[PDB]
Structure 1
Amino acid sequence: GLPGMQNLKADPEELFTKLEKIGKGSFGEVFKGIDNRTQKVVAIKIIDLEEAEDEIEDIQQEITVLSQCDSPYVTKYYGSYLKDTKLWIIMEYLGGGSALDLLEPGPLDETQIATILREILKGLDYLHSEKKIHRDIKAANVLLSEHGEVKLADFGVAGQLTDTQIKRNTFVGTPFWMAPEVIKQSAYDSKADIWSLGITAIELARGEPPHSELHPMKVLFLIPKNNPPTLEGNYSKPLKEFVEACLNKEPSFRPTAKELLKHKFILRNAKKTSYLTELIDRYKRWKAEQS
C-alpha cells in the first residue's frame, strides 16, 4: 500500500507539453514545460522508476513533502503523474536562476545578501512551523523568479517531524553545509537548517562555503572537531554577528528562523526583492559573454 500516492494522477501529456532539460534535482532530471490550460510555463521533474532502487522510499516522501507545502517561499508542486515507467512531478517554474548561479559573475553586496537571506528565512519559518526540515539548505537550492522572487527548492532529502518522532538522525545533506550533529548522526531537528543557513550566509558573502577546496570526506571530521566557521573579511558587524548566531555548535543556542527575521542585519539591509533583477541581468550578461 501507498498512503502518499492517494492523489497520484494519470496521462500528463493531456494537460502538459514537455520541453527541454533545464537541469537536475534530487532523484531526477528537470525539464521546462507548458500547462496547456493556462499557457503558463512549469518545471517537470522526471524520475525513471525502473532505474530507481533504494531512492523509491525517498521519492514517495518528496512527492508528499511538496504536496503538503503551500507557501510563496517554497517551490509550488502542482501534481504527480504516472506515465508508464516515468513519474512526472510538475513544479513551479522559476526563470531567474539559483542564488549559486547569481554568484558566478562576482560578489553580492550586503543589501542583496540580506534580501536573499530574509526570503530564505521566511521559507524556513514556514517549513519549521509545519514540522519539516529542509536538510539541504545551500545557494544551489535557493531559486529566483525572473522578477527576483526567492524560493526554496529541492525537497528530496526533506525530513518530517511528528508527535512520535521529535528528532531525526539520518546522514543527509551536502557535506560543506551539514550541521555537526547531522554528520555525527545524533538526534537533530530544524536547528540543523539554521546551521546550514549560516553556512549559506558565508557562501552568499564569500561565494563558497568554508572548506570548499577540500575533499568532502575531510570535512566530515573537520566540522564536528573544529571551532565553528566565522565570516572573515571586510563585512559589516551585523552580518558577522548574524553568521556567528547561526554557527553555534550547540543547536539549542542557534536562534529560530522567526528570531533571525528580526536580526539587525536583515532589518538594516534587506530591500525589495524586485531589486534582485539587477543580479539576474548581471548573470545573463555574464553567461552570454563566457567562452
Structure 2
Amino acid sequence: DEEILEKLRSIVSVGDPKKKYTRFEKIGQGASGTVYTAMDVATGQEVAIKQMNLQQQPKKELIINEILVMRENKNPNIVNYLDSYLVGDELWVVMEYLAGGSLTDVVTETCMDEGQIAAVCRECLQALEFLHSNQVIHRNIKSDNILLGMDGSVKLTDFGFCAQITPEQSKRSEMVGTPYWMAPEVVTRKAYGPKVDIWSLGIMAIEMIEGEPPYLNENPLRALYLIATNGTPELQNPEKLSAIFRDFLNRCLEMDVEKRGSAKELLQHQFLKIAKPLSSLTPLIAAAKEATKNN
C-alpha cells in the first residue's frame, strides 16, 4: 500500500537532521538501513542515527510498530529513542549511542565470570519486567540486541519483532525470532506469551557461558528441529557452574511455561545476588574491542 506508507510519514516529523546533529560518521550498514554516529550541536550528546529509504523497505507496518513501541516504552535498560526525521523519501531514526558496543563481541571473545553474567542478566530482566508489564513481548532477545555503555550499562535494542498483546488477545502463534534463541513453544506454533523472552534470555546466558547458543554449528532449520525435539538444551560442561547459576538457567529454560519464571520472579533469584558492579564489564569491553580490531 501507499496508504501504509502515508501512515508512516504521518507519525514522523518533517525537518533536517543537520539542524540539530552534525559530525555524521558511518559505523555500518544493515539489511534495513545505514547506521551512523553523531553529535548534538548544543549539548554534546553522542547519538546513533539510522538512515533508511522507505521506497525500498518492504513491510512498512513493522517500521511503524518499532517506532511506536520505542516512543511509548522508555526505560533505563532500553536504548532510548530521541527523535526521527522525515527527509523526502528517507527516514532518519535517532537513538542513544552506546559506545561499549554489542554484548555479542564480549560473548565471542572473552570469558565472563558468574558475577559479570549475573549483572547483565539482572539488567536485562529489569527491561523485560518493564516491557512485560506493558504488554510488550520483545521476541528477539539475544546478545546481538544488547548494547553496552562505556560504563558497563546494559541496554536492550531492536524492537522490530516485538508484539503487543491485550486481554482480548494475550498470546501469539507465529514463528517469530532468531532460530537458536526461540522458545520451543514458538518453534512448534503453540500459543505463547511473555515468557518466550525469558527462554531467549536463558539462551543468552548460555552464550555468556559457552560463547554460542546451542546448535550454532547447525543450520537454522536443523536447529529449529533440534529445539523442537530436545527441549531444555544441554550444557557442554554443567559441572563448571555454581548450584545457584544452574538453578537460574533451569528456571529460564523450563519447558513448562507455567513453571518457567517470569521476569519479576527471576529478578529475585539468588544467582543475581552474586552480581558484580556494572563497572566490571569495562575490561570485557576493552578485550572485545582489541580482539575485533582486524575485523
TM-score normalised by L of structure 1 = 0.93
Following the alignment from structure 1 to structure 2, what is the Cα–Cα distance between the partners of residues 78 and 25? 20
Following the alignment from structure 1 to structure 2, what is the Cα–Cα distance between the partners of residues 226 and 85? 47
**Which residue of 120, 126, 135 maps to 2:124?**
120
Following the alignment from structure 2 to structure 1, what is the Cα–Cα distance between the partners of residues 265 and 30? 30
| Counterparts in 2 of 1:162 and 1:200: CA distance versus 1, 3 Å | same
Decide whether the 8 Å contact of 1:4 with 1:63 is kept in 2: no
Does 2:176 align with 1:172?
yes
Match of 1:248 in 2: 254
**Which residue of 195, 219, 226 maps to 2:223?**
219
| Counterparts in 2 of 1:184 and 1:24: CA distance versus 1, 3 Å | farther
Q: Quote the offset at 1:165 in angstroms.
A: 2.0
Q: Which runs of 5+ in 2 are unaligned?
A: none
Offset from partner CA, 1:18-62 (integer Å, 9 cap, x none): 622223567323211222231211010122111112x21101111
Following the alignment from structure 2 to structure 1, what is the Cα–Cα distance between the partners of residues 14 and 194? 35
Decide whether the 8 Å contact of 2:110 with 2:287 is kept in 1: no
Alignment of 1:8-23 (within 5 A): 8-11=12-15, 12-17=17-22, 19-23=24-28
Q: Which moved further from structure 2: 273-282 or 88-97?
A: 273-282
| Counterparts in 2 of 1:159 and 1:24: CA distance versus 1, 3 Å | farther
**Which residue of 64, 69, 89 maps to 1:65?**
69
Q: Which runs of 5+ in 1 are unaligned?
A: none
Following the alignment from structure 2 to structure 1, what is the Cα–Cα distance between the partners of residues 136 and 9? 19
Q: How many residues align structurally?
A: 288
TM-score normalised by L of structure 2 = 0.92
Match of 1:284 in 2: 289
RMSD: 1.9
Offset from partner CA, 1:162-197 (integer Å, 9 cap, x none): 232211222211100001121222221111101101
- Name the % identity: 42
Decide whether the 8 Å contact of 2:115 with 2:275 is kept in 1: yes
Decide whether the 8 Å contact of 1:25 with 1:45 is kept in 2: no
Decide whether the 8 Å contact of 1:231 with 1:243 is kept in 2: no
Q: Quote the offset at 1:202 in angstroms.
A: 0.6
Following the alignment from structure 1 to structure 2, what is the Cα–Cα distance between the partners of residues 189 and 146? 33
Decide whether the 8 Å contact of 1:4 with 1:61 is kept in 2: no
Following the alignment from structure 1 to structure 2, what is the Cα–Cα distance between the partners of residues 279 and 225? 35
Once superposed, which parts of structure 1, at least 4 consecutive aligned residues long, lie more than 3 Å away?
1-7, 23-26
Q: Which moved further from structure 2: 117-126 or 156-165?
A: 156-165
Does 2:82 align with 1:87?
no
Q: Quote the offset at 1:103 in angstroms.
A: 2.2
Following the alignment from structure 1 to structure 2, what is the Cα–Cα distance between the partners of residues 68 and 25? 25
Following the alignment from structure 2 to structure 1, what is the Cα–Cα distance between the partners of residues 265 and 287? 32
Match of 2:266 in 1: 260
Following the alignment from structure 1 to structure 2, what is the Cα–Cα distance between the partners of residues 93 and 85? 24
Match of 2:154 in 1: 150
